[PDB]
Design a protein around this ligand. Structure first.
Ligand SMILES: Oc1ccc(-c2ccc3c(-c4ccc(N5CC[NH2+]CC5)cc4)n[nH]c3c2)cc1
Length: 288
């Protein structure tokens, strides 16, 4: 078996497994020591049938990184684990409204008959919450390496939570040509120094955060639509920068451009971005 950790261990019989989200929705009974009769909706990460000892090592590594990083409102938090006498279950916060790309696309104005719409303030608030999560992760020396709307999850109460911050990635084993579930190329979020020289820093995460701002203000738009990997390289070498979204202020576009500084040292930090977004949220209208 695996070494037990009574900080985190939840008995297997307290976890009611549900539908697939390998991640499944579950109900945890008595997740809190001081509340044994409460059911909490949670997300449970586990191994598939075909999983190797590498796959199991990777899942343990992610869980250990989460214990190490500790709790923040704007990240997907570890809640517990089932490690003894059965398959490994890593129990994390459940975000009922899915990833931020989906959440934004679902709330586009009619064109599509959505039940809800977002104000300008709501969009900036989203950006602020992600910046604050990233400021926390950077403070714990965590480099995300794939910060994108697809890796931000939205809770029932519309809280933004950074996901997949603990993930094991062999960066020398990346397939630049492999597309996401949704058919997009993750290379389109990578800083040039990460992409060409495989150097990942908090500064390359700020570059990704610039692409994430662009996703927010396009309500889940696809960066460089129709651009293959070889053409993206030529664009980045030429110093191409994506156009300003409509319904994006000059100030937020300059923030995106600052995140996209060719010189990593000249990008704003997440600490900087949190302060600036805090000010902009307060001055942004929720009336449209
Ligand atoms: O290493 C990982 C750790 C956590 C997760 C993870 C993935 C999905 C969720 C979700 C989640 C919640 C709702 C959905 N929906 C289905 C599709 N859209 C509507 C809502 C999808 C995923 N909540 N919490 C999660 C944690 C994935 C990898």
């Amino acid at each position: 078996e695996l070494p037990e950790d009574p900080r985190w261990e939840l008995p297997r019989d307290r976890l009611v497994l549900g539908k697939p989200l390998q991640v499944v929705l579950a109900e945890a009974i008595g997740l809190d020591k001081d509340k044994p009769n409460r059911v909490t909706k949670v997300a449970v990460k586990m191994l598939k049938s075909d999983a190797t000892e590498k796959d199991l090592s990777d899942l343990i590594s992610e869980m250990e990184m989460m214990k190490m990083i500790g709790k923040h409102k704007n990240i997907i938090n570890l809640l517990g684990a089932c490690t003894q006498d059965g398959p490994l279950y890593v129990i994390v916060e459940y975000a009922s409204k899915g990833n931020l790309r989906e959440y934004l696309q679902a709330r586009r104005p009619p064109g599509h008959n959505p039940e809800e719409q977002l104000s300008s303030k709501d969009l900036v608030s989203c950006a602020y919450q992600v910046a604050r999560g990233m400021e926390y992760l950077a403070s714990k020396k965590c480099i995300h390496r794939d910060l994108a709307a697809r890796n931000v999850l939205v809770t029932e109460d519309n809280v933004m939570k950074i996901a997949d911050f603990g993930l094991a990635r062999d960066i020398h084993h990346i397939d630049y040509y492999k597309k996401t579930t949704n058919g997009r190329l993750p290379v389109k979020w990578m800083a040039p120094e990460a992409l060409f020289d495989r150097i990942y820093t908090h500064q390359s995460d700020v570059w990704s955060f610039g692409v994430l701002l662009w996703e927010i203000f396009t309500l889940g738009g696809s960066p460089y639509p129709g651009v293959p990997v070889e053409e993206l390289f030529k664009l980045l070498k030429e110093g191409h920068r994506m156009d300003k979204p409509s319904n994006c202020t000059n100030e937020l576009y300059m923030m995106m451009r600052d995140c996209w500084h060719a010189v990593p040292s000249q990008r704003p930090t997440f600490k900087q971005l949190v302060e600036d977004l805090d000010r902009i949220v307060a001055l942004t209208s929720n009336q449209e």
